[PDB]
């Protein structure tokens, strides 16, 4: 019957600055609220229990506060090592999680386009890959154009975890067509991003 809601769902904070994550519950004198850090491929790690007691070994920059229904995980001086998803927990309810990332200066993507290989074409399919490399922030618009026809809903995007070294993202966009569809046309990926003064288009002719 208890529902935990975290705010915000995602958070970008500059290196060495303060990050705060909120958690409110639906609802001996203990508060029975825990905070967990989770990095990809790892189980969550307990940071704070009883709302404000740090687990030994957790850096002092992690602190918890709050009472009753409203609780807050604070990270003073965010490190790149703290990029993770944080969860609150009360009894058997978990918050929905809050992604924490390093905020950094805008970095425009370098754009690269890869035609389908002949190996793939012989297998009967054609994947066109558009690479957006080392950019920030994560929002980027990738438009596919096939003989200048704007493509909608037939590509798939994937985005890396933020790079711990330079705090950037990379993104791949894959347009997949049947070999037959690919042969019927003569291919461009147009990238819009905060760091680009005008869109960058990379294109190639089939053949």
């Amino acid at each position: 019957d208890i529902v935990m809601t975290q705010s915000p769902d995602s958070l970008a904070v500059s290196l060495g600055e303060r990050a705060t994550i909120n958690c409110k519950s639906s609802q001996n004198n203990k508060n029975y609220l825990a905070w967990y850090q989770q990095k990809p491929g790892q189980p969550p790690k307990l940071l704070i229990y009883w709302a404000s007691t740090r687990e030994s070994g957790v850096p002092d920059r992690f602190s918890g506060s709050g009472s009753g229904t409203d609780f807050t995980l604070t990270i003073s001086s965010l490190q790149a090592e703290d990029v993770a998803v944080y969860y609150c927990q009360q009894y058997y309810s978990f918050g929905g999680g809050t992604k924490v990332e390093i905020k950094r200066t805008v970095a425009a993507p370098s754009v690269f386009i890869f035609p389908p290989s002949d190996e793939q074409l012989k297998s009967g399919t054609a994947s066109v890959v558009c690479l957006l490399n080392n950019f920030y922030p994560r929002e980027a618009k990738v438009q596919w154009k096939v003989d200048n026809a704007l493509q909608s809903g037939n590509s798939q995007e994937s985005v890396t975890e933020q790079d711990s070294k330079d705090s950037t993202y990379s993104l791949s966009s894959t347009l997949t067509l049947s070999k037959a569809d690919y042969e019927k046309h003569k291919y461009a990926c147009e990238v819009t991003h905060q760091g680009l003064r005008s869109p960058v288009t990379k294109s190639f002719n089939r053949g």
């Binding site: 386009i113 190996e119 994947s127 690479l131 994937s158 985005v159 791949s172």
Partner: protein, 219 residues
């Protein structure tokens, strides 16, 4: 040293059952309730239930009542979670976690991936993403490998057998409507290297016992 060590990833078809184990050591097994928590890929944490290892008494989330069974074997300090009548939305990493006196989970198993799907295990097809002028910007060329149509997760990718880590980006897999996964791995290198330095992506799909090494050559 408290450790909770879970059994390995499993793949199940819809309608089947899965049983995950969790071997505890480093503390008195019967003194702490063991809970199960699951996490679908990219999603949050979902509590499933607990077992009192000292009695076998259980309590399950209403969402799993009638499908989950938790048991333990105290002689080998092992907790078990069985989930039956599986559907693809039971695809998740299942965790065992020991509750503490503060009603927090201070110790977690490493997780057990359970994939529920009708798809058959299948190694990837690996296709080069070749560097050319159309993947060259300011003396930097990008190249990569497309790792297509495999099941289940995961695959690992390295470059030049792990000697090449700078500039490497391996993208999270996307699950296609076919039920198969595909990803790309890319690396950015100096353009001046393309005529002298060989680039090979090493693709390892342990579920299908597939390893592919693909040379990626310019143009």
């Amino acid at each position: 040293q408290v450790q909770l060590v879970q059994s390995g990833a499993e793949v199940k078809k819809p309608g089947a059952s899965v049983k995950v184990s969790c071997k505890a050591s480093g503390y008195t097994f019967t003194g702490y309730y063991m809970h199960w928590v699951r996490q679908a890929p990219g999603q949050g944490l979902e509590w499933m239930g607990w077992i009192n290892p000292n009695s076998g008494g259980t309590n399950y989330a209403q969402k799993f009542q009638g499908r989950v069974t938790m048991t333990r074997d105290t002689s080998i300090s092992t907790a078990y979670m069985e989930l039956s009548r599986l559907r693809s939305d039971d695809t998740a990493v299942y965790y065992c976690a020991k509750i503490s006196g503060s009603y927090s989970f201070d110790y977690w198993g490493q997780g057990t991936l359970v994939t529920v799907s009708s798809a058959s295990t299948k190694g990837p097809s690996v296709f080069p993403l070749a560097p050319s002028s159309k993947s060259t910007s300011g003396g930097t060329a990008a190249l990569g490998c497309l790792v297509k149509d495999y099941f289940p997760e995961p695959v690992t990718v390295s470059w030049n057998s792990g000697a090449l880590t700078s500039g490497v980006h391996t993208f999270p897999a996307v699950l296609q409507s076919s039920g198969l996964y595909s990803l790309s791995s890319v690396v950015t290198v100096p353009s001046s290297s393309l005529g002298t330095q060989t680039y090979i992506c090493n693709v390892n799909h342990k579920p299908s016992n597939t390893k592919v090494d693909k040379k990626v050559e310019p143009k």
